[PDB]
Amino acid sequence: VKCKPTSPGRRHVVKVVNPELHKGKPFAPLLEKNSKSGGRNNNGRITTRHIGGGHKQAYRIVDFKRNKDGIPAVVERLEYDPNRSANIALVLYKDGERRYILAPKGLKAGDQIQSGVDAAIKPGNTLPMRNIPVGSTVHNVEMKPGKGGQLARSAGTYVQIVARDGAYVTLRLRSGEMRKVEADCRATLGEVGNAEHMLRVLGKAGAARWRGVRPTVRGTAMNPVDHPHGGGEGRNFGKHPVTPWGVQTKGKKTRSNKRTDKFIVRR
Protein backbone atom coordinates (compact mmCIF):
# COMPACT_ATOMS: atom_id res chain seq x y z
CA VAL A 1 0.00 0.00 0.00
CA LYS A 2 0.93 3.69 0.14
CA CYS A 3 -2.14 5.63 1.30
CA LYS A 4 -4.84 5.89 3.97
CA PRO A 5 -6.34 3.68 4.99
CA THR A 6 -4.39 0.50 4.33
CA SER A 7 -6.19 -2.71 3.46
CA PRO A 8 -6.50 -5.47 6.10
CA GLY A 9 -4.69 -8.74 5.45
CA ARG A 10 -6.14 -11.89 6.97
CA ARG A 11 -3.61 -14.05 8.83
CA HIS A 12 -2.71 -17.68 8.12
CA VAL A 13 -5.41 -19.65 9.96
CA VAL A 14 -7.39 -21.49 7.29
CA LYS A 15 -5.77 -20.63 3.93
CA VAL A 16 -6.71 -17.04 3.99
CA VAL A 17 -5.54 -13.94 2.12
CA ASN A 18 -6.34 -10.24 1.26
CA PRO A 19 -10.07 -9.14 1.72
CA GLU A 20 -11.68 -5.64 1.04
CA LEU A 21 -13.47 -3.15 3.25
CA HIS A 22 -13.66 0.62 3.54
CA LYS A 23 -13.06 3.20 6.26
CA GLY A 24 -16.77 3.15 6.61
CA LYS A 25 -19.93 4.50 5.06
CA PRO A 26 -22.12 4.20 8.24
CA PHE A 27 -25.05 2.11 7.58
CA ALA A 28 -25.20 -1.34 6.18
CA PRO A 29 -28.38 -0.91 4.31
CA LEU A 30 -29.24 1.16 1.13
CA LEU A 31 -32.09 3.50 -0.07
CA GLU A 32 -34.66 2.29 -2.68
CA LYS A 33 -33.95 3.29 -6.31
CA ASN A 34 -32.98 -0.13 -7.76
CA SER A 35 -34.28 -3.00 -9.94
CA LYS A 36 -34.09 -6.80 -9.61
CA SER A 37 -31.22 -7.71 -11.95
CA GLY A 38 -31.11 -10.53 -14.47
CA GLY A 39 -29.65 -13.91 -13.60
CA ARG A 40 -27.27 -15.98 -15.73
CA ASN A 41 -25.13 -15.98 -18.85
CA ASN A 42 -27.14 -17.76 -21.51
CA ASN A 43 -28.79 -16.24 -24.53
CA GLY A 44 -32.43 -17.13 -25.11
CA ARG A 45 -31.21 -20.67 -25.84
CA ILE A 46 -27.42 -21.42 -25.83
CA THR A 47 -24.82 -20.52 -23.14
CA THR A 48 -22.92 -17.89 -25.16
CA ARG A 49 -19.47 -16.73 -24.04
CA HIS A 50 -18.97 -19.55 -21.58
CA ILE A 51 -18.30 -18.97 -17.87
CA GLY A 52 -20.69 -17.09 -15.58
CA GLY A 53 -22.59 -18.41 -12.58
CA GLY A 54 -22.64 -18.39 -8.78
CA HIS A 55 -25.34 -16.79 -6.62
CA LYS A 56 -25.61 -13.65 -4.46
CA GLN A 57 -26.73 -10.52 -6.34
CA ALA A 58 -29.66 -8.10 -6.75
CA TYR A 59 -29.29 -4.36 -6.22
CA ARG A 60 -29.29 -2.37 -9.46
CA ILE A 61 -28.85 1.31 -8.41
CA VAL A 62 -28.29 4.11 -10.94
CA ASP A 63 -27.59 7.66 -12.24
CA PHE A 64 -25.04 8.95 -14.74
CA LYS A 65 -25.12 11.77 -17.30
CA ARG A 66 -26.48 14.24 -14.74
CA ASN A 67 -29.09 16.10 -16.80
CA LYS A 68 -29.87 18.30 -13.79
CA ASP A 69 -27.65 21.39 -13.46
CA GLY A 70 -26.86 24.38 -11.24
CA ILE A 71 -28.58 23.15 -8.09
CA PRO A 72 -26.30 22.43 -5.05
CA ALA A 73 -25.88 18.78 -4.17
CA VAL A 74 -24.64 17.51 -0.80
CA VAL A 75 -23.02 14.09 -0.35
CA GLU A 76 -25.37 12.11 1.87
CA ARG A 77 -23.03 9.17 2.36
CA LEU A 78 -20.60 6.92 0.53
CA GLU A 79 -22.03 3.49 -0.25
CA TYR A 80 -20.97 0.12 -1.63
CA ASP A 81 -22.50 -1.04 -4.95
CA PRO A 82 -22.09 -4.71 -6.17
CA ASN A 83 -20.21 -6.04 -9.19
CA ARG A 84 -18.65 -2.61 -9.76
CA SER A 85 -15.92 -1.48 -7.36
CA ALA A 86 -16.33 2.28 -7.58
CA ASN A 87 -18.34 3.05 -4.44
CA ILE A 88 -21.23 5.40 -5.08
CA ALA A 89 -21.99 8.20 -2.53
CA LEU A 90 -25.63 9.33 -2.39
CA VAL A 91 -26.16 13.11 -2.60
CA LEU A 92 -29.20 15.36 -2.04
CA TYR A 93 -30.00 18.54 -3.93
CA LYS A 94 -31.49 21.75 -2.58
CA ASP A 95 -34.97 20.58 -3.51
CA GLY A 96 -35.04 17.14 -1.93
CA GLU A 97 -33.77 15.41 -5.08
CA ARG A 98 -31.53 12.32 -4.77
CA ARG A 99 -29.45 10.85 -7.60
CA TYR A 100 -26.44 8.59 -6.89
CA ILE A 101 -23.16 9.35 -8.72
CA LEU A 102 -19.81 7.52 -8.81
CA ALA A 103 -18.08 8.36 -5.53
CA PRO A 104 -14.93 10.36 -6.43
CA LYS A 105 -11.94 10.54 -4.07
CA GLY A 106 -12.18 13.37 -1.61
CA LEU A 107 -15.90 13.23 -0.94
CA LYS A 108 -17.84 11.93 2.08
CA ALA A 109 -19.02 14.60 4.58
CA GLY A 110 -21.40 16.78 2.53
CA ASP A 111 -19.12 18.82 0.24
CA GLN A 112 -19.80 21.22 -2.63
CA ILE A 113 -20.80 19.33 -5.79
CA GLN A 114 -22.31 21.28 -8.70
CA SER A 115 -23.20 20.46 -12.29
CA GLY A 116 -24.01 22.51 -15.35
CA VAL A 117 -21.89 24.80 -17.49
CA ASP A 118 -19.67 27.03 -15.34
CA ALA A 119 -19.35 25.26 -11.99
CA ALA A 120 -16.69 24.86 -9.30
CA ILE A 121 -13.79 22.85 -10.74
CA LYS A 122 -13.10 20.39 -7.92
CA PRO A 123 -14.74 16.92 -8.10
CA GLY A 124 -18.36 17.98 -7.71
CA ASN A 125 -20.25 17.07 -10.84
CA THR A 126 -20.16 16.61 -14.63
CA LEU A 127 -19.30 19.56 -16.91
CA PRO A 128 -19.08 20.08 -20.69
CA MET A 129 -15.50 19.35 -21.67
CA ARG A 130 -15.52 22.79 -23.29
CA ASN A 131 -15.89 24.46 -19.89
CA ILE A 132 -12.81 22.63 -18.63
CA PRO A 133 -9.07 23.51 -18.50
CA VAL A 134 -6.57 20.71 -19.10
CA GLY A 135 -8.56 18.23 -17.08
CA SER A 136 -5.48 16.14 -16.30
CA THR A 137 -8.19 14.41 -14.36
CA VAL A 138 -11.80 14.63 -15.71
CA HIS A 139 -13.99 11.48 -15.42
CA ASN A 140 -16.67 9.22 -17.00
CA VAL A 141 -17.06 11.21 -20.22
CA GLU A 142 -19.42 10.25 -23.06
CA MET A 143 -18.58 9.45 -26.68
CA LYS A 144 -21.68 11.51 -27.41
CA PRO A 145 -22.84 14.77 -25.75
CA GLY A 146 -25.74 13.07 -24.01
CA LYS A 147 -25.29 9.73 -22.27
CA GLY A 148 -22.71 9.24 -19.54
CA GLY A 149 -20.99 6.06 -20.64
CA GLN A 150 -17.22 5.97 -21.12
CA LEU A 151 -15.17 5.00 -18.06
CA ALA A 152 -17.84 4.40 -15.41
CA ARG A 153 -15.33 1.93 -13.98
CA SER A 154 -14.35 4.90 -11.76
CA ALA A 155 -12.11 2.68 -9.60
CA GLY A 156 -8.82 4.48 -10.19
CA THR A 157 -9.98 4.99 -13.81
CA TYR A 158 -8.88 8.35 -15.22
CA VAL A 159 -8.70 10.40 -18.40
CA GLN A 160 -6.40 13.23 -19.48
CA ILE A 161 -7.31 15.94 -21.97
CA VAL A 162 -4.74 18.27 -23.56
CA ALA A 163 -5.14 21.72 -22.01
CA ARG A 164 -6.90 23.42 -24.93
CA ASP A 165 -7.66 21.34 -27.97
CA GLY A 166 -9.79 22.83 -30.71
CA ALA A 167 -11.93 21.15 -33.36
CA TYR A 168 -14.04 20.07 -30.38
CA VAL A 169 -12.49 16.66 -29.58
CA THR A 170 -9.90 15.32 -27.13
CA LEU A 171 -9.28 12.87 -24.22
CA ARG A 172 -6.71 10.20 -23.39
CA LEU A 173 -8.16 7.03 -21.89
CA ARG A 174 -5.82 4.73 -19.94
CA SER A 175 -4.53 2.03 -22.30
CA GLY A 176 -6.98 3.44 -24.82
CA GLU A 177 -4.09 5.59 -26.02
CA MET A 178 -5.43 8.69 -27.76
CA ARG A 179 -8.97 9.26 -29.02
CA LYS A 180 -10.97 12.34 -29.98
CA VAL A 181 -14.51 12.76 -28.69
CA GLU A 182 -17.20 15.39 -29.20
CA ALA A 183 -16.34 18.39 -27.03
CA ASP A 184 -20.02 19.24 -26.53
CA CYS A 185 -19.85 16.36 -24.07
CA ARG A 186 -19.44 16.67 -20.32
CA ALA A 187 -17.21 15.01 -17.72
CA THR A 188 -17.66 14.60 -13.98
CA LEU A 189 -14.25 16.32 -13.70
CA GLY A 190 -13.62 14.59 -10.40
CA GLU A 191 -12.25 11.31 -11.80
CA VAL A 192 -11.59 8.83 -8.98
CA GLY A 193 -13.07 5.78 -7.34
CA ASN A 194 -10.30 4.65 -4.99
CA ALA A 195 -7.67 2.30 -6.44
CA GLU A 196 -6.83 0.15 -3.41
CA HIS A 197 -10.47 -0.91 -3.78
CA MET A 198 -8.91 -3.21 -6.33
CA LEU A 199 -5.65 -4.00 -4.60
CA ARG A 200 -6.51 -7.21 -2.63
CA VAL A 201 -6.53 -10.78 -3.92
CA LEU A 202 -9.80 -12.77 -3.89
CA GLY A 203 -8.23 -15.38 -1.62
CA LYS A 204 -8.93 -19.00 -2.54
CA ALA A 205 -11.53 -19.54 -5.27
CA GLY A 206 -14.76 -20.56 -3.58
CA ALA A 207 -15.70 -17.98 -0.97
CA ALA A 208 -14.00 -15.41 -3.21
CA ARG A 209 -14.31 -16.53 -6.83
CA TRP A 210 -17.30 -18.86 -7.04
CA ARG A 211 -19.24 -15.99 -5.47
CA GLY A 212 -19.12 -14.36 -8.84
CA VAL A 213 -18.21 -16.52 -11.79
CA ARG A 214 -17.67 -20.22 -12.63
CA PRO A 215 -14.36 -22.00 -13.38
CA THR A 216 -13.20 -19.68 -16.16
CA VAL A 217 -10.38 -22.16 -16.72
CA ARG A 218 -10.44 -25.01 -19.23
CA GLY A 219 -6.91 -25.17 -20.57
CA THR A 220 -6.10 -27.98 -22.99
CA ALA A 221 -8.00 -30.57 -20.99
CA MET A 222 -7.47 -32.58 -24.18
CA ASN A 223 -10.32 -34.42 -25.97
CA PRO A 224 -9.89 -33.24 -29.62
CA VAL A 225 -13.50 -32.06 -29.97
CA ASP A 226 -14.33 -30.05 -26.85
CA HIS A 227 -11.59 -27.66 -27.95
CA PRO A 228 -9.31 -27.16 -31.03
CA HIS A 229 -6.57 -29.17 -29.28
CA GLY A 230 -6.39 -32.29 -27.15
CA GLY A 231 -5.41 -35.93 -26.87
CA GLY A 232 -1.67 -36.47 -26.85
CA GLU A 233 0.13 -38.69 -24.35
CA GLY A 234 0.29 -35.87 -21.82
CA ARG A 235 1.39 -32.62 -23.50
CA ASN A 236 0.38 -29.91 -26.04
CA PHE A 237 2.40 -29.16 -29.26
CA GLY A 238 0.76 -26.94 -31.88
CA LYS A 239 -1.89 -24.25 -31.70
CA HIS A 240 -4.28 -23.79 -28.80
CA PRO A 241 -6.93 -21.29 -29.87
CA VAL A 242 -10.64 -21.92 -29.32
CA THR A 243 -12.60 -21.72 -32.57
CA PRO A 244 -9.50 -20.68 -34.61
CA TRP A 245 -9.72 -17.36 -32.77
CA GLY A 246 -5.96 -17.26 -33.10
CA VAL A 247 -4.89 -16.03 -29.67
CA GLN A 248 -1.71 -14.74 -31.31
CA THR A 249 -2.82 -11.12 -30.90
CA LYS A 250 -4.49 -10.62 -34.28
CA GLY A 251 -6.48 -7.62 -33.14
CA LYS A 252 -9.94 -6.88 -34.54
CA LYS A 253 -12.46 -4.07 -34.89
CA THR A 254 -12.16 -2.98 -38.60
CA ARG A 255 -13.83 -0.43 -40.99
CA SER A 256 -17.28 0.94 -39.92
CA ASN A 257 -18.25 4.04 -38.00
CA LYS A 258 -15.83 5.39 -35.40
CA ARG A 259 -12.22 4.23 -35.88
CA THR A 260 -11.38 7.92 -36.10
CA ASP A 261 -9.32 7.91 -32.89
CA LYS A 262 -5.58 8.53 -32.80
CA PHE A 263 -2.01 7.77 -31.85
CA ILE A 264 -2.40 4.19 -30.49
CA VAL A 265 1.02 2.49 -30.24
CA ARG A 266 2.05 -1.17 -30.15
CA ARG A 267 4.99 -1.39 -27.73
Add this chain to the structure above:
RNA sequence: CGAAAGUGGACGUAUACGGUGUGACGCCUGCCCGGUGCCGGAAGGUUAAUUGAUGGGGUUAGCGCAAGCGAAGCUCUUGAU
Protein backbone atom coordinates in the same frame (compact mmCIF):
# COMPACT_ATOMS: atom_id res chain seq x y z
C1' C B 1 -26.08 -17.56 -30.03
C1' G B 2 -28.64 -16.17 -34.43
C1' A B 3 -30.10 -16.69 -42.42
C1' A B 4 -32.07 -11.71 -39.73
C1' A B 5 -34.44 -9.02 -36.03
C1' G B 6 -32.67 -9.49 -31.66
C1' U B 7 -29.81 -11.41 -27.07
C1' G B 8 -25.77 -12.52 -24.01
C1' G B 9 -20.98 -9.84 -22.67
C1' A B 10 -23.39 -5.70 -19.09
C1' C B 11 -28.10 -2.18 -17.33
C1' G B 12 -20.81 -3.59 -16.93
C1' U B 13 -17.07 0.36 -19.76
C1' A B 14 -9.63 -0.84 -19.38
C1' U B 15 -8.64 -1.37 -11.27
C1' A B 16 -13.57 -3.70 -17.03
C1' C B 17 -14.64 -7.97 -20.17
C1' G B 18 -12.71 -12.10 -23.30
C1' G B 19 -9.04 -16.01 -24.99
C1' U B 20 -4.62 -18.74 -24.19
C1' G B 21 -0.91 -21.05 -20.94
C1' U B 22 1.14 -21.77 -15.90
C1' G B 23 -1.25 -23.57 -10.94
C1' A B 24 -0.24 -21.28 -3.18
C1' C B 25 4.13 -19.69 -1.34
C1' G B 26 9.80 -19.20 -1.45
C1' C B 27 14.44 -18.40 -4.75
C1' C B 28 14.03 -18.03 -9.63
C1' U B 29 12.69 -18.44 -14.79
C1' G B 30 19.31 -18.67 -18.84
C1' C B 31 21.04 -18.78 -24.89
C1' C B 32 18.43 -19.27 -30.00
C1' C B 33 13.75 -15.14 -34.29
C1' G B 34 17.29 -19.84 -38.65
C1' G B 35 11.84 -23.06 -39.46
C1' U B 36 6.28 -22.14 -38.65
C1' G B 37 2.91 -18.75 -36.61
C1' C B 38 1.90 -13.70 -35.16
C1' C B 39 3.06 -8.04 -35.06
C1' G B 40 4.78 -3.66 -37.93
C1' G B 41 6.40 -1.68 -42.82
C1' A B 42 4.65 -1.70 -47.66
C1' A B 43 8.98 1.56 -51.35
C1' G B 44 9.75 -2.17 -55.43
C1' G B 45 8.40 -7.34 -58.06
C1' U B 46 3.87 -10.78 -59.00
C1' U B 47 -1.08 -10.67 -59.04
C1' A B 48 -8.48 -11.12 -59.34
C1' A B 49 -12.98 -9.12 -61.13
C1' U B 50 -13.32 -5.00 -63.98
C1' U B 51 -12.42 -1.44 -68.98
C1' G B 52 -11.17 -3.59 -73.16
C1' A B 53 -6.41 -0.83 -77.08
C1' U B 54 -4.36 -3.73 -81.06
C1' G B 55 -4.18 -7.59 -84.43
C1' G B 56 -6.24 -12.20 -86.71
C1' G B 57 -10.66 -15.15 -88.84
C1' G B 58 -15.98 -15.74 -90.62
C1' U B 59 -19.80 -13.63 -93.71
C1' U B 60 -20.38 -10.22 -98.27
C1' A B 61 -21.86 -5.03 -101.64
C1' G B 62 -18.59 -4.38 -105.03
C1' C B 63 -13.83 -5.27 -108.28
C1' G B 64 -13.24 -9.65 -111.88
C1' C B 65 -14.72 -15.55 -117.97
C1' A B 66 -10.89 -17.31 -113.86
C1' A B 67 -7.43 -16.66 -109.92
C1' G B 68 -8.46 -14.16 -106.02
C1' C B 69 -9.21 -9.15 -103.03
C1' G B 70 -12.38 -7.67 -100.14
C1' A B 71 -14.99 -2.36 -97.48
C1' A B 72 -19.22 -1.10 -93.86
C1' G B 73 -22.14 -3.79 -90.64
C1' C B 74 -22.84 -8.01 -87.77
C1' U B 75 -20.01 -11.73 -85.65
C1' C B 76 -15.75 -15.49 -83.49
C1' U B 77 -11.29 -14.70 -81.48
C1' U B 78 -7.26 -11.82 -79.35
C1' G B 79 -6.13 -9.60 -75.22
C1' A B 80 -2.65 -3.61 -74.58
C1' U B 81 -4.00 -0.86 -70.45
